[PDB]
Amino acid sequence: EIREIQAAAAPTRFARGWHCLGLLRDFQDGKPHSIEAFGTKLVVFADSKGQLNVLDAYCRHMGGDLSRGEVKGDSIACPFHDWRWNGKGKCTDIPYARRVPPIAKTRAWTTLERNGQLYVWNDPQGNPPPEDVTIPEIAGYGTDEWTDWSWKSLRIKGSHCREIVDNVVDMAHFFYIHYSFPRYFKNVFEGHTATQYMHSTGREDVISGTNYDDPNAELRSEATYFGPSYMIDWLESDANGQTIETILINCHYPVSNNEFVLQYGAIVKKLPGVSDEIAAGMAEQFAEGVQLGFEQDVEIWKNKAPIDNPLLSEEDGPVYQLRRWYQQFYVDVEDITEDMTKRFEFEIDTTRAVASWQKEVAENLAKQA
Amino acid sequence: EIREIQAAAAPTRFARGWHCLGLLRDFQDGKPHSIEAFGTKLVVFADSKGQLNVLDAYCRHMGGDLSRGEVKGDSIACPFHDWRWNGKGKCTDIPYARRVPPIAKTRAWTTLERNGQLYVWNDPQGNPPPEDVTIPEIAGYGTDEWTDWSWKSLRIKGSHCREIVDNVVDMAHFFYIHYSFPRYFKNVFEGHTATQYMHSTGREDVISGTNYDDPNAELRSEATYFGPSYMIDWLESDANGQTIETILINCHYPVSNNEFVLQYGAIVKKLPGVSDEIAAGMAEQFAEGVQLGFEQDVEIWKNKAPIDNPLLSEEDGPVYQLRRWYQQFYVDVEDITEDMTKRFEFEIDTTRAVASWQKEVAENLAKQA
Amino acid sequence: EIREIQAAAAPTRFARGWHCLGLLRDFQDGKPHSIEAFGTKLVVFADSKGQLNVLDAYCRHMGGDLSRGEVKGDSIACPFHDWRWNGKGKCTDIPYARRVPPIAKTRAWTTLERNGQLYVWNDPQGNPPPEDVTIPEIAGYGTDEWTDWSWKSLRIKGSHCREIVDNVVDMAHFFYIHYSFPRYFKNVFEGHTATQYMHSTGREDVISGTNYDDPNAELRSEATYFGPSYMIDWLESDANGQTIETILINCHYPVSNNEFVLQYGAIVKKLPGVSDEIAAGMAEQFAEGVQLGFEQDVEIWKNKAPIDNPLLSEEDGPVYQLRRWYQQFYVDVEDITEDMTKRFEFEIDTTRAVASWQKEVAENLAKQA
């Protein structure tokens, strides 16, 4: 009769897939950069041609942190004894010795530079990514007609990253936590992707930058995880008689199985006749509206319990199917089963919820008399 | 020849019994309140009639912290998706859905409202409290002739709560740590209670509010634990020719097996002809004198080792019998043995100690010339 | 092909040997002093004749921290109930009782007062130190012709103390981390000692107090660990036509197997015709130059990985032989093998490294045009 919460320990294994480490522009300063991810530490640095390299951060000589070193030429120089390591992981020079042991080779991670971002491939099995597991090129990025990224990040301590992934099915929380108003909500999972289609409006009683200065903006969203960690969200807003195109990133990487970094950011297509500056300000506003919602999630996650047996209502999204899909990335590729990857679609009938949320928004308006 | 300290790991099991969570007045503000106890988290809230309810804090939908929610009607509303939970643990409404799953029932803890306090019943076996395991009604509380509580609390990190319980037999430390002067000291353990009878005086060399502005006040104390965690101490002071009646609470709850909350507080009987205000100031002073002693204990506990094999002198209280009594609350009721619960009495002959403490207080007086 | 880092968990066992706890002058204030070492806590205090005593800090009565007590006579008085413990570990008085249980005896550690320092003997097997395992008397210490110690300390969190010991063979890091310029480098390990002989010069491009105000000072160093934790370094500098004699301590004690205290300090022989004050200022300057290098090591250690399989170059010192020697102190004396203790000598041919470091220092000079 009393329902109890069940929760297994978070896996120690990290998701197999592409993970965005951040913006190319932040990494292309010619300095080394430290990334604590997947239970270890990595070093990111640009070579003299500007290509980004990602190595295990721990120097194979005496364990020094390469990310606290310095770039010299096309090699990263260790701060402890200045050995030089290139983008292939090869030690290219021990500056105080004649020869280099041939076995001096560390791990260079597989990278992708795309969409103004740096992605790395994680796989505990150690295989390269298949050609068909990739990150889509966002068509508009880098054209004159779109802004650069307004980009933000948040460090979440005390939660496993499944907590963020669960949101792809959580229609109700976009009302309570993101202060939007969902009207249509549909999920489709298939292969290594998970998609949410939503149509929402702003709420009258709460003001958010995501509405682009129209409290009743309709927003059409197609949001897809391409693998375990990286979502692209294509949005179109009808705000004050205009149609605005926004592309929002929602992504993360695990620091450990109890800590992750959440990065999110927006580009906006320049409306006819608006300057670069005005468009950049629309991107920034949209990103700040997203921030508000994510900071609320952070408070939810900070205080909540993990739960493997959530009790779902009739108006809930397909959490269990999402989780079964997500599990593919935590088993060897050989152990993947059809029920993880088979096409699964579910649409929530929102008519109940909309009735209720309208009453709520209305009597929160009456709340001025 | 070298004596070594032995100490088993602190139990993971929490004491079976009534635990005071705090003052009703603090909980009856219509807001939810978070309590981290017994290795979990609880939510306390008043319904619309003012009755207090205590539930598991973790929402059975998706794990949300109910204690960061809001009270609506007679239900607590989860901050994540606003499901409503009543005092019986029943989900009364999913505001955006037509129906509620019948299996939506969480744990409502058994409570007691008494003595201006809220108590909850803990039992890992999951049974209700027997009729004869209860908290005494303090006769004077809530009458015109007694004050309300002057109440204080302290959070102790890095100790198991047995450390506070041990004090019920520790005559000597009331001199060194509490700066009183014990003259008579007797213990009686029986059933689920443990009692200390003491007569003490203030020390000349040290000034304390517990002496009510008479450095030589005699104090008669009857102090009893009613179960594992909650002590009521009935005190009568003869200070400046008056007889003052005080009732002191000393209680705690375990946060984890290495952290606990200590709450203590006093009511004073109004002397003939004194105002409510004057009496409240006597309660506050008494509570501040107790605080001094407890803050010293905190320093003792912060730095000490746990010890299962204490080496006792002739003037020590019956630590081992106290601990055997205390063990009853950490075994199933079926496994309780007669030697835990049998009447056991021991009186310390204080004549040695008094001689010594007088010399000490005297030569600390001479300490002005 | 990819080389991986291997690292076993740090031992839980602590090194057998003499460990310096600090300066006698700091301990001879008549107050008790707390030392967290070897996974436990110790109390240091002077008796009424000024002799230092070291006991287990945890009182055998009820676990009180003796190091937060007070010295009375030749005994330390516990802060909880004022029992008195002498330098032999014997309880000498329970001030409020007639008798003391004969079995009231705690652990007095074996100490040495020498070189203005206090050393204690650690051995998990519980044996006394053999006559031939000792700390050398530094001839000059306490004579008119030498200063007292300029002494410094650093607390290192998140590293095992093997990290500091490894430096005895690490020629290259004296250039990159200590900003000296090694010209000759030789190790000899034998018995319970490990020695580094080095000749170095200052670097032009970097200024350090260790050069005594001559940027090209030659320095001759004989540095020896006498057991696992304590190194004496005899130095002679030829700076601005003078010959300066310095003796530098480099030592530590383990707090836990992941935290240690590093203490280091210098005495200087008074040059003909210089005052005590001028000599003390040379000691202080030398100590501050050492500090600079050690603070850099702290940054190296803070960020590095532990590594049991370091990959060594032709110009590396004999790390593996050093570690095998060091292992003697973590096995029972009976289990020591000849390969740990046999004489082993290795000299690095520095000619390669010197060429390279000169180029580097030179083009860092050109770095002003």
Ligand SMILES: C[C@]12CCC(=O)C=C1CC[C@@H]1[C@@H]2CC[C@]2(C)C(=O)CC[C@@H]12
């Ligand atoms: C990116 C996102 C979060 C996590 C997730 O899993 C799916 C989505 C898609 C909808 C986005 C939302 C973030 C907040 C957005 C911008 C709104 O305020 C309305 C639409 C909504």
Ligand SMILES: C[C@]12CCC(=O)C=C1CC[C@@H]1[C@@H]2CC[C@]2(C)C(=O)CC[C@@H]12
């Ligand atoms: C409440 C208490 C503490 C813990 C315990 O176990 C038993 C007692 C009873 C005596 C109280 C004492 C607290 C300090 C008091 C008020 C004094 O200063 C003299 C009498 C003494």
Ligand SMILES: C[C@]12CCC(=O)C=C1CC[C@@H]1[C@@H]2CC[C@]2(C)C(=O)CC[C@@H]12
């Ligand atoms: C004490 C020490 C550190 C750890 C070790 O293992 C061996 C030595 C001996 C050489 C000392 C060095 C400390 C820094 C010194 C003073 C210099 O700047 C040049 C010589 C060098």
Ligand code: FES
């Ligand atoms: S640890 Fe990297 S060069 Fe030595």
Ligand code: FES
């Ligand atoms: S987690 Fe409580 S309503 Fe969803």
Ligand code: FES
């Ligand atoms: S604990 Fe040291 S005297 Fe009681």
Ligand SMILES: [Fe+3]
């Ligand atoms: Fe969210």
Ligand SMILES: [Fe+3]
């Ligand atoms: Fe106490």
Ligand SMILES: [Fe+3]
């Ligand atoms: Fe060093």
